[PDB]
Amino acid sequence: MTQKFDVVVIGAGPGGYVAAIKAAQLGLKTACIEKYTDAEGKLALGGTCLNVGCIPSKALLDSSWKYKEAKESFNVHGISTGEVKMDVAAMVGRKAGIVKNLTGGVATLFKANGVTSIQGHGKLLAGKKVEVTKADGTTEVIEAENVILASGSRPIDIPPAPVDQNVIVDSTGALEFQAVPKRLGVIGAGVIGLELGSVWARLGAEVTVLEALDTFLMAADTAVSKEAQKTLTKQGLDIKLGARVTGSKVNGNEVEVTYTNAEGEQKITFDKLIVAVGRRPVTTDLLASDSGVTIDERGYIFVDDYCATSVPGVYAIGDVVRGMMLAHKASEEGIMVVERIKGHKAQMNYDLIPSVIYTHPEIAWVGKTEQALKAEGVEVNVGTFPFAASGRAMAANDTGGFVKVIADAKTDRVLGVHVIGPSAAELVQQGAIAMEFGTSAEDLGMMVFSHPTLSEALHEAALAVNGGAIHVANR
Amino acid sequence: MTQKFDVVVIGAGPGGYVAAIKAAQLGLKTACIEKYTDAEGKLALGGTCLNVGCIPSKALLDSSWKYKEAKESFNVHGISTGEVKMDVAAMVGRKAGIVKNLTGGVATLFKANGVTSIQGHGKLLAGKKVEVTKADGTTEVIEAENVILASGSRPIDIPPAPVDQNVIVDSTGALEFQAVPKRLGVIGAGVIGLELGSVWARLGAEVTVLEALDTFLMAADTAVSKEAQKTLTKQGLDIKLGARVTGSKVNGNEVEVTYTNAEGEQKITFDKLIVAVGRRPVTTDLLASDSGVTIDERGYIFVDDYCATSVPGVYAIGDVVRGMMLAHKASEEGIMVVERIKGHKAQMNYDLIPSVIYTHPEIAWVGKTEQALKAEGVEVNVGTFPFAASGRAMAANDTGGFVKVIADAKTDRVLGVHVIGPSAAELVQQGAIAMEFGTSAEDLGMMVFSHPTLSEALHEAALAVNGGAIHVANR
Ligand SMILES: Cc1cc2nc3c(=O)[nH]c(=O)nc-3n(C[C@H](O)[C@H](O)[C@H](O)COP(=O)(O)OP(=O)(O)OC[C@H]3O[C@@H](n4cnc5c(N)ncnc54)[C@H](O)[C@@H]3O)c2cc1C
Ligand SMILES: Cc1cc2nc3c(=O)[nH]c(=O)nc-3n(C[C@H](O)[C@H](O)[C@H](O)COP(=O)(O)OP(=O)(O)OC[C@H]3O[C@@H](n4cnc5c(N)ncnc54)[C@H](O)[C@@H]3O)c2cc1C
Ligand SMILES: Nc1ncnc2c1ncn2[C@@H]1O[C@H](COP(=O)(O)O)[C@@H](O)[C@H]1O
Ligand SMILES: Nc1ncnc2c1ncn2[C@@H]1O[C@H](COP(=O)(O)O)[C@@H](O)[C@H]1O
């Protein structure tokens, strides 16, 4: 009666469900354990990303942008509308429908690939045995030749502003508001905070973003974060740096927030408050005391470059291990691990994992920032092209931003591509693909880019590296 | 004394003006001769592409799509408006201001780079001598060490439908309507005809496209053209294949068109008629009898792979020579010619020039079609991914279409990338960049693509080539 599998995956987020599908495709008898259930009380796959993360946030960002554009940027095209209105419930409902479709899609993929789906909480015991606590309390132990831990992360909750799922919410609650909060506060100016604040600012919320640090998007290239702060501020996000929240007091349907900055203590009242101060790895009841799996100082499962833990045949991927907390990072780690289980020498290039921020203008990058390369003493040539000079962007009425390409001054090898503007993620992916092949700035400049397209902005920026751009003056 | 230049470029379109800027950047004393001037007396730099082609069409396509979307696809996002109306004069005026800004931009680039612009009609005489006939009829002969012929193209004019720029227009008049015609006819279902028909259909015109051939977009992959005909028909373009126009009679503010199809002669009346039956190379008074420059059977200037004519030091680029009549082809041929004048061994890869159709959904491709590869006996593996399975596309409410990757069955080398759907041009550019580096489908599949992004559809299609797609069943 004891079930035996070649691979047992704990967690069905982008890391775990992709790993499970890949394992099954490679002929490995695979099981995937997941505890999450939807509103009908049924197993729902896809993790944070699908259910309360990437997908729902992108749906609201696209809907809210259309509303803002209709209100402010239709007249220039000769288009008049009556009063523009937003049925918030319908917007949230569209998002809920997308999530339902996609979670159903993952279940379908599991069935088509032969993945054994097991609803419950999984715990790794000694000897690669996994204890599954089923939805009804029944426990069952299964045996695995290989175990993949992909338990993900959860929002950080801080004593100064505890979430109550009503007036003070985390990112999950922020995607479920029934009405536009008249005054919205956001703690944390990270990617999640800026995305969530953008959604509601577009729909009319007076938005204030309280950020404890004195830097804005420190991971982005300095020129990109400078431009981002300027534009987001103009879009109604009152971004306050050096503003550390120290306490809060919920008074019925409002919250008075206290924070400290260069001018001492300040108080501000909001109708809703979103706490977006980071995410922490989840290992809650994931490991028996004698599992042998090492956890580092910050709660992450310790792994090598191939996602192997301290225990043979046990791997860990995604948000629960070191690295950028991104969905594509999790999925590709899952692929690597399964390929390696099959004996292939798969590996990941952590230096070419792109980052995307889905504000408008979209922000994206891959490789190193200019400030980082200068700090490391690497001499570089930089080429920039603004969308204000792009005929395609002018046609689209979306000319803010630029493309920045950074190359090694001696070898001309492209070390980083940074974009703030239309189709940023797509242009950065072009850069990433070229970088995978060890492209030089000159190699990109020598290629034929379709005209007129936003892609041309990357081509011009690459040419600008060596002072050869056609559509911008060269210095 | 006679003006003397290292390079004399005849024509200031994307081939000519880019060739002029680059020559100047490389230290060559350069002149660019252009005959056309706008209503404000300014030299019409940018040629067909900027003044009456690429840019104006893209501007109207973008404005008209926003109108269609607001009327038909805002409700799903929860967005309501009053009545959505289009001020056609204002839409066309926005386009006119974009054209004015960009033409001014090229003038600024010419000045910053030291290009001597000369207003007039240039003619190549024997001995690389160029006669410029000014607008007042005066002539001046300038001496050149190198001549670049970039005279471009013009619409084909046909006896059955003479253009009067009122009831019967060509592509130039089609971008200037001041009101939506109730009934619009388009002769020719080529790229230009489909784009122009789409603009007006979106704004309420009843559009009929009369095409003499029984094929539709034969240059596109069969799966792409099939989908395109289906979706364009659903958008209100009544595309009639095998319908050859034989005559037309203007009756006041109407035109009765007579055409022949499977039921013999038919008659149909329109308020406006667009003649989009192709384009022809322009060599009108471009060459003296004894210039020595060979013209082929279709009126194109004959050139080798490096755009060199039969006369040493004389080159021809863009629409006036063989190849795809595209802006990026013209510009890159311009760059190749100039680099070679300087002694560099630059080369054009005609196999990797992408094609784009700016309808909605956008269509783009690079490399070979599946039908061509089959006809040539090349064994292939095909991978397809539909946007209906893309989380990013779902969030954007734009899921129509797919990505198709074709690889050599023996070497796995990517031979073609075809896309119909959102950001088709950008995804195709990712494919073209990879193909420049000799990518295999597996190489693309091993790269990390940001999630959620439209780019992921290319990643999945690449994986599907070898039956390894994650998000669609592999059958
Ligand atoms: C609002 C928001 C927006 C985001 N937007 C983006 C974006 O645009 N792009 C991007 O790349 N990333 C984004 N992220 C991050 C992204 O969601 C994560 O990086 C990704 O979900 C990590 O995948 P994972 O598989 O590691 O973990 P998760 O997706 O968190 O999946 C872990 C799963 O394991 C389950 N689980 C945990 N413990 C157990 C157990 N013991 N037994 C059984 N099951 C268990 C959980 O129920 C969960 O379903 C966003 C996150 C948030 C919160
Ligand atoms: C409606 C429409 C839409 C289009 N859309 C696209 C698109 O989306 N993408 C794309 O790639 N292509 C598009 N094209 C095609 C594109 O415009 C051409 O391929 C491109 O302009 C060719 O550039 P060129 O430099 O060869 O010639 P042109 O742009 O035609 O420039 C030739 C110039 O030379 C001048 N000239 C001619 N003879 C002389 C002379 N004897 N002396 C001096 N000057 C002279 C002309 O006045 C003109 O300015 C489109 C065309 C049309 C009509
Ligand atoms: N108490 C706090 N008040 C304000 N900002 C905070 C507080 N605690 C953390 N943060 C910020 O929250 C942000 C979270 O960023 P990230 O992890 O990228 O989402 C960081 O920039 C932190 O400085
Ligand atoms: N008299 C005509 N009636 C209908 N279609 C025509 C006629 N003459 C040319 N065409 C079509 O016009 C199209 C021009 O397409 P292209 O050159 O790609 O822009 C071709 O597909 C021709 O078949």
Side-chain angles (χ1 to χ4, degrees):
Chain A
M1 189 171 181
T2 298
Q3 308 188 60
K4 300 184 63 173
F5 298 93
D6 289 326
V7 176
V8 169
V9 183
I10 302 180
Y17 88 71
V18 170
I21 291 171
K22 190 58 178 176
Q25 288 180 359
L26 296 182
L28 300 166
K29 185 185 171 186
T30 305
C32 178
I33 305 162
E34 169 65 62
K35 65 183 171 67
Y36 184 76
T37 58
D38 63 18
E40 300 184 346
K42 301 177 191 304
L43 175 58
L45 305 171
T48 299
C49 184
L50 209 166
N51 297 284
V52 296
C54 327
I55 298 302
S57 59
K58 270 72 281 178
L60 302 195
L61 284 158
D62 288 356
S63 295
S64 57
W65 178 256
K66 290 186 189 297
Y67 170 90
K68 187 200 205 317
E69 202 175 17
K71 255 190 149 57
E72 299 174 6
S73 302
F74 267 36
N75 291 358
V76 69
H77 295 278
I79 301 164
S80 57
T81 59
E83 184 179 4
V84 183
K85 294 175 180 179
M86 176 55 91
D87 177 342
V88 177
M91 179 187 67
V92 170
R94 190 189 75 104
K95 173 266 287 186
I98 289 164
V99 170
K100 185 178 184 184
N101 176 301
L102 290 168
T103 62
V106 183
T108 296
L109 293 169
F110 268 24
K111 187 181 179 180
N113 286 282
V115 175
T116 295
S117 183
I118 303 173
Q119 182 184 345
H121 177 99
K123 178 183 288 187
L124 177 59
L125 308 180
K128 301 185 295 187
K129 295 180 185 177
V130 174
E131 170 188 278
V132 180
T133 297
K134 300 170 187 176
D136 65 12
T138 297
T139 62
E140 183 189 350
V141 172
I142 69 182
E143 300 180 3
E145 298 291 345
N146 299 102
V147 177
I148 303 179
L149 304 170
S151 49
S153 65
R154 65 162 65 95
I156 295 175
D157 199 38
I158 59 175
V163 164
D164 62 19
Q165 302 183 46
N166 176 24
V167 176
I168 304 181
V169 299
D170 59 21
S171 54
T172 297
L175 297 161
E176 299 178 342
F177 295 150
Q178 301 188 198
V180 177
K182 198 174 190 303
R183 302 162 300 177
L184 176 61
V186 177
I187 312 182
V191 175
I192 291 173
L194 298 175
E195 286 183 5
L196 295 176
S198 290
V199 171
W200 302 105
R202 294 164 186 179
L203 301 175
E206 180 189 3
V207 182
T208 307
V209 180
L210 302 170
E211 169 57 48
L213 301 171
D214 288 308
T215 57
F216 183 73
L217 296 175
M218 191 175 58
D221 178 271
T222 303
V224 170
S225 50
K226 185 173 188 296
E227 178 68 11
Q229 196 179 341
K230 179 183 176 180
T231 312
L232 293 171
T233 297
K234 193 161 188 173
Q235 296 168 23
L237 297 188
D238 183 13
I239 298 163
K240 295 183 170 184
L241 303 179
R244 188 168 179 179
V245 174
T246 56
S248 60
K249 195 167 189 168
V250 178
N251 296 308
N253 62 7
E254 296 183 343
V255 57
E256 190 183 38
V257 174
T258 302
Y259 66 98
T260 299
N261 59 5
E263 304 171 12
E265 278 197 357
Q266 307 301 323
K267 296 195 175 191
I268 184 171
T269 303
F270 305 116
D271 298 290
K272 297 295 187 179
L273 177 61
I274 299 167
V275 184
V277 299
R279 294 178 62 81
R280 60 185 182 91
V282 167
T283 62
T284 315
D285 300 321
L286 177 70
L287 305 171
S289 60
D290 62 358
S291 68
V293 176
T294 297
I295 305 300
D296 73 17
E297 68 284 357
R298 308 208 314 275
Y300 296 91
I301 294 179
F302 177 67
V303 293
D304 64 10
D305 289 345
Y306 307 111
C307 290
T309 67
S310 49
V311 177
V314 178
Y315 305 92
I317 63 182
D319 286 6
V320 80
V321 306
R322 76 297 175 264
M324 295 173 287
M325 292 200 169
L326 300 174
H328 47 285
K329 181 271 198 183
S331 291
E332 298 304 320
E333 284 181 329
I335 297 295
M336 169 177 66
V337 168
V338 170
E339 289 286 357
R340 289 183 66 86
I341 284 172
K342 264 297 195 187
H344 303 119
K345 302 186 299 181
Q347 192 176 22
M348 283 200 70
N349 189 344
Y350 288 93
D351 301 357
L352 301 182
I353 301 180
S355 294
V356 187
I357 306 177
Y358 299 82
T359 43
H360 197 100
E362 189 173 82
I363 301 167
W365 69 93
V366 66
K368 293 281 190 176
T369 63
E370 185 177 0
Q371 67 275 20
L373 291 164
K374 288 176 178 167
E376 299 176 17
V378 179
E379 195 73 357
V380 296
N381 287 324
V382 178
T384 300
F385 185 82
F387 289 103
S390 166
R392 186 71 192 85
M394 289 181 189
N397 194 44
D398 190 2
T399 56
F402 58 86
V403 176
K404 176 171 179 169
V405 175
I406 308 178
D408 186 87
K410 189 57 181 293
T411 70
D412 199 40
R413 179 185 286 265
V414 176
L415 307 175
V417 178
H418 306 264
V419 187
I420 178 167
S423 294
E426 271 61 70
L427 306 203
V428 163
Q429 197 69 52
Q430 292 171 16
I433 289 166
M435 291 173 74
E436 276 286 357
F437 290 109
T439 194
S440 66
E442 182 179 16
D443 290 334
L444 275 169
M446 208 159 283
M447 300 176 190
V448 181
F449 280 68
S450 299
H451 179 89
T453 64
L454 297 173
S455 303
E456 291 177 284
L458 175 57
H459 179 246
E460 292 282 341
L463 289 170
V465 172
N466 295 116
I470 298 303
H471 295 93
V472 286
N474 297 285
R475 309 300 175 181
Chain B
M1 186 176 180
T2 301
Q3 281 183 110
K4 291 168 287 189
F5 301 94
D6 298 318
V7 177
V8 171
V9 178
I10 302 179
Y17 90 74
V18 170
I21 291 167
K22 186 59 183 178
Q25 287 180 2
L26 297 177
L28 301 171
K29 188 183 177 184
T30 304
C32 182
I33 310 167
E34 172 61 54
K35 69 187 179 181
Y36 207 86
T37 52
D38 69 35
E40 297 175 326
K42 304 174 188 301
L43 197 50
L45 304 177
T48 296
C49 176
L50 187 45
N51 293 283
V52 294
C54 321
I55 299 298
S57 55
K58 270 73 283 178
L60 302 194
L61 282 158
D62 285 359
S63 296
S64 62
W65 178 256
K66 290 185 188 304
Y67 174 91
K68 175 171 172 71
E69 201 181 12
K71 279 203 160 192
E72 298 178 2
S73 304
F74 267 30
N75 173 257
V76 70
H77 297 279
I79 309 167
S80 58
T81 61
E83 180 187 359
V84 177
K85 308 91 74 189
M86 176 61 86
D87 174 342
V88 174
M91 178 185 68
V92 174
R94 186 189 73 104
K95 172 271 282 181
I98 289 167
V99 169
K100 180 181 176 172
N101 174 302
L102 287 168
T103 55
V106 180
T108 301
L109 292 165
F110 268 24
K111 189 172 184 299
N113 286 284
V115 173
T116 297
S117 61
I118 302 178
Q119 193 182 148
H121 176 95
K123 184 175 192 180
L124 180 58
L125 310 180
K128 299 183 293 185
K129 213 80 172 185
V130 179
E131 180 194 62
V132 181
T133 301
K134 308 292 292 179
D136 67 0
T138 60
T139 59
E140 179 186 349
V141 175
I142 65 183
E143 177 171 352
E145 301 215 14
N146 299 94
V147 176
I148 295 173
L149 303 169
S151 52
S153 60
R154 65 193 289 98
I156 291 177
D157 196 43
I158 64 174
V163 171
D164 61 19
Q165 299 298 29
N166 184 1
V167 174
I168 305 182
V169 302
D170 55 21
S171 51
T172 294
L175 297 166
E176 301 296 335
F177 302 150
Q178 294 296 301
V180 182
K182 181 182 170 59
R183 299 167 301 176
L184 175 63
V186 179
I187 312 181
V191 174
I192 293 172
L194 297 174
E195 289 183 4
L196 297 169
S198 295
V199 165
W200 302 109
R202 291 161 186 183
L203 303 180
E206 179 185 5
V207 182
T208 302
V209 181
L210 303 171
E211 167 58 48
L213 297 170
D214 287 307
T215 52
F216 179 79
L217 294 177
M218 78 179 306
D221 179 272
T222 304
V224 170
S225 64
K226 184 174 175 176
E227 180 71 6
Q229 195 182 349
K230 177 182 177 177
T231 185
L232 291 173
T233 298
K234 184 187 170 66
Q235 293 166 32
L237 298 194
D238 183 15
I239 299 166
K240 293 184 172 186
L241 302 181
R244 161 171 292 281
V245 175
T246 58
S248 64
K249 287 173 58 57
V250 181
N251 297 321
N253 283 316
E254 295 184 342
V255 55
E256 189 179 54
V257 175
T258 70
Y259 65 99
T260 307
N261 61 8
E263 308 179 38
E265 279 197 351
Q266 298 296 156
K267 301 202 174 197
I268 184 171
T269 302
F270 308 111
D271 299 295
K272 295 297 182 72
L273 179 62
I274 300 170
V275 182
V277 300
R279 293 178 64 82
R280 56 191 291 255
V282 171
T283 60
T284 316
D285 296 321
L286 180 65
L287 302 169
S289 296
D290 59 0
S291 67
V293 177
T294 303
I295 302 299
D296 74 11
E297 71 286 357
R298 311 193 309 182
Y300 296 87
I301 295 176
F302 182 67
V303 295
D304 65 13
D305 296 340
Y306 304 108
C307 290
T309 68
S310 50
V311 177
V314 178
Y315 307 86
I317 60 178
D319 286 10
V320 80
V321 303
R322 78 295 177 264
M324 319 185 72
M325 287 197 173
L326 301 174
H328 47 285
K329 180 272 205 181
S331 292
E332 297 302 321
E333 283 180 331
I335 296 293
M336 171 181 61
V337 171
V338 170
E339 289 282 351
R340 293 178 68 82
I341 285 165
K342 283 289 294 187
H344 296 97
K345 193 177 182 178
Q347 198 173 24
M348 281 280 295
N349 188 343
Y350 290 93
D351 299 0
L352 302 183
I353 298 176
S355 295
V356 188
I357 306 178
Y358 299 83
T359 43
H360 200 103
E362 190 173 84
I363 304 166
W365 70 95
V366 66
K368 308 224 67 165
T369 64
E370 186 175 2
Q371 69 273 17
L373 291 161
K374 286 190 61 172
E376 295 165 11
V378 179
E379 188 177 316
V380 298
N381 285 328
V382 176
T384 300
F385 186 81
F387 288 105
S390 167
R392 186 73 193 85
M394 290 180 78
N397 194 49
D398 193 6
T399 56
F402 59 85
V403 176
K404 175 167 176 176
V405 176
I406 310 172
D408 185 87
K410 301 201 73 177
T411 68
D412 198 39
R413 190 181 192 92
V414 175
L415 305 178
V417 177
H418 305 265
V419 183
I420 176 165
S423 296
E426 273 59 71
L427 306 203
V428 161
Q429 196 69 52
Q430 289 168 20
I433 288 163
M435 292 169 77
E436 275 282 6
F437 289 108
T439 195
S440 64
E442 179 178 7
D443 289 337
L444 275 173
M446 288 188 295
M447 299 179 187
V448 176
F449 280 69
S450 300
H451 176 89
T453 63
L454 297 170
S455 302
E456 290 177 286
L458 173 60
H459 179 249
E460 293 281 341
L463 289 170
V465 171
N466 295 110
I470 297 297
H471 292 91
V472 288
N474 293 286
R475 302 174 180 273

